[PDB]
Amino acid sequence: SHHHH
Amino acid sequence: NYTDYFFDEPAFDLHDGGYVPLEVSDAPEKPLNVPPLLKPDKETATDVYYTVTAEAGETQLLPGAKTKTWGYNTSLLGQTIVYRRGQHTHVTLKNTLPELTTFHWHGANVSGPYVDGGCHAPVYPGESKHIDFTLEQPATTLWLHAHPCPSTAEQVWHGLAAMVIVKDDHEASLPLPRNYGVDDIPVILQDRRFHENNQWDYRADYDPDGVAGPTAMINGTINPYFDVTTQKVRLRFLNGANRREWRLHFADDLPFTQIGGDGSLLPEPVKFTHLMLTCAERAEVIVDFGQYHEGDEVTLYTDDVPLLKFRIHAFKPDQTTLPDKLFDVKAPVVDPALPVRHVVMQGMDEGVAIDGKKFAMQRIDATQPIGKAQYWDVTNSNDAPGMVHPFHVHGTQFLVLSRNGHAPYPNEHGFKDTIGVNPGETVRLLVRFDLPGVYMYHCHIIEHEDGGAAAQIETFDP
Numbered sequence: 416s417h418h419h420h
Numbered sequence: 421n422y423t424d425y426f427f428d429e430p431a432f433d434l435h436d437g438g439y440v441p442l443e444v445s446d447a448p449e450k451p452l453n454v455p456p457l458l459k460p461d462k463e464t465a466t467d468v469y470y471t472v473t474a475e476a477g478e479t480q481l482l483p484g485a486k487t488k489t490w491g492y493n494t495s496l497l498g499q500t501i502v503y504r505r506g507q508h509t510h511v512t513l514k515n516t517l518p519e520l521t522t523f524h525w526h527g528a529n530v531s532g533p534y535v536d537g538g539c540h541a542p543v544y545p546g547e548s549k550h551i552d553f554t555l556e557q558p559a560t561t562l563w564l565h566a567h568p569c570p571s572t573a574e575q576v577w578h579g580l581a582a583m584v585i586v587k588d589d590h591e592a593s594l595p596l597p598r599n600y601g602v603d604d605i606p607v608i609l610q611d612r613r614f615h616e617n618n619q620w621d622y623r624a625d626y627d628p629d630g631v632a633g634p635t636a637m638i639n640g641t642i643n644p645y646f647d648v649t650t651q652k653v654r655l656r657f658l659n660g661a662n663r664r665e666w667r668l669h670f671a672d673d674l675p676f677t678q679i680g681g682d683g684s685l686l687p688e689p690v691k692f693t694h695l696m697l698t699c700a701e702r703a704e705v706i707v708d709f710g711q712y713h714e715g716d717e718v719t720l721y722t723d724d725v726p727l728l729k730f731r732i733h734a735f736k737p738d739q740t741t742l743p744d745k746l747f748d749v750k751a752p753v754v755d756p757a758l759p760v761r762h763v764v765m766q767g768m769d770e771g772v773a774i775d776g777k778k779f780a781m782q783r784i785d786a787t788q789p790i791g792k793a794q795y796w797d798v799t800n801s802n803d804a805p806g807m808v809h810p811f812h813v814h815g816t817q818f819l820v821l822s823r824n825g826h827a828p829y830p831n832e833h834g835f836k837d838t839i840g841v842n843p844g845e846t847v848r849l850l851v852r853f854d855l856p857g858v859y860m861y862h863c864h865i866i867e868h869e870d871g872g873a874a875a876q877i878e879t880f881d882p
């Protein structure tokens with residue numbers, strides 16, 4: 416689900 | 421809404437003009453290289469003897485041709501060197517490279533400038549030097565790397581870095597994974613750019629603001645995996661990159677506990693999901709894989725880029741718990757007679773400087789008496805947009821008192837030799853030198869060091 420920046 | 425890291429989001433490397441994104445390599449997955457422990461030439465309880473040889477070779481990094489590389493007692497990086505507190509240590513330094521080099525023990529409280537192995541300690545091709553010393557400092561992860569001035573960046577790029585493990589009695593008594601290569605591993609974080617025939621070319625990739633390539637390399641491995649055979653694993657993160665910052669987290673935000681920083685155990689364990697490391701910073705963490713099962717592969721990322729896969733095998737349950745206190749940090753009292761030292765890092769690119777000046781090898785910039793603790797106020801004067809400058813001091817382990825008058829970051833309450841200073845920020849350090857001589861302080865973006873953003877301090881007996 417989660418992605419970074 | 422919020423960044424998951426402690427540093428100032430606008431200052432991250434990824435905002436820089438010439439930023440080089442990491443890209444996933446198509447190279448096949450392979451086992452993480454774990455450097456062997458360097459066998460002593462001889463050891464007794466009181467004395468240990470090592471030979472450390474800088475050498476050139478070839479390493480199979482990508483399919484096809486082998487990459488020409490340099491290492492310590494191996495073709496790339498180096499065998500891990502174990503030192504013990506209070507043990508008289510003897511090292512023969514041998515250079516078999518075509519270039520002169522230097523053997524810098526980053527974080528080791530040894531005398532400078534010769535044993536320290538900075539600018540003033542050249543070892544020419546074909547020659548040998550003999551050093552000895554006794555470490556009187558807490559257990560931690562240090563490292564060895566080349567430090568000729570200039571040319572540190574290029575030599576590190578060729579592959580001259582190695583992990584150094586310092587043992588003591590206190591750390592040995594803690595319930596920590598300590599089976600090297602099995603449940604306790606180096607994670608040396610680097611990046612490179614491969615050119616034709618899988619070769620490196622520092623000069624083609626040069627940038628005065630910091631060299632970074634798009635291919636991540638972990639312990640000299642491309643697309644590494646690690647076979648986990650225990651519930652808990654200790655990772656010794658070292659940022660051995662020329663410039664790049666690592667923003668480390670697992671794919672699913674698996675928590676991990678930091679137990680160690682640059683210079684010592686942390687006073688207390690600190691729980692993390694996301695951890696940012698600037699150049700030369702070390703962080704020792706325990707990961708608990710107890711919620712996973714045989715066949716699972718759990719991947720450690722920086723930003724959105726996968727770095728290191730953990731293949732879960734069968735493991736016995738581990739019921740142990742960390743104590744609430746790991747380590748007693750005994751802060752020195754500042755010498756009241758001594759002023760506050762102000763150090764200003766200025767400029768970017770070619771214009772980087774400290775206190776208005778570029779490095780000069782003959783010149784002493786500062787003095788401080790040994791045995792006496794002093795406040796160092798260190799300012800990153802870089803306007804917005806700026807960058808996080810990792811400030812390093814040779815020959816001391818310092819303590820972090822405050823950041824812009826506020827608390828240090830949660831993982832900055834132990835001893836450290838390198839600290840990331842945000843744009844505009846003043847940090848206050850407590851700095852004591854135990855030994856007399858000449859020591860360097862500088863930014864540890866290695867292109868900044870080479871570009872002259874360094875100064876030297878003379879320590880003397882009063």
Ligand SMILES: [Cu+2]
Nearest residue numbers: 420429430435
């Ligand atoms: Cu942004």
Ligand SMILES: [Cu+2]
Nearest residue numbers: 466467508509
């Ligand atoms: Cu001795």
Ligand SMILES: [Cu+2]
Nearest residue numbers: 510511551552
């Ligand atoms: Cu000796």
Ligand SMILES: [Cu+2]
Nearest residue numbers: 526565700864
């Ligand atoms: Cu260093």
Ligand SMILES: [Cu+2]
Nearest residue numbers: 526527813814
């Ligand atoms: Cu250093």
Ligand SMILES: [Cu+2]
Nearest residue numbers: 417669673694
């Ligand atoms: Cu995350």
Ligand SMILES: [Cu+2]
Nearest residue numbers: 714732733734
């Ligand atoms: Cu298995």
Ligand SMILES: [Cu+2]
Nearest residue numbers: 436629768807
């Ligand atoms: Cu910059």
Ligand SMILES: [Cu+2]
Nearest residue numbers: 567814860862
């Ligand atoms: Cu240095």
Ligand SMILES: [Cu+2]
Nearest residue numbers: 809863865868
């Ligand atoms: Cu810098």
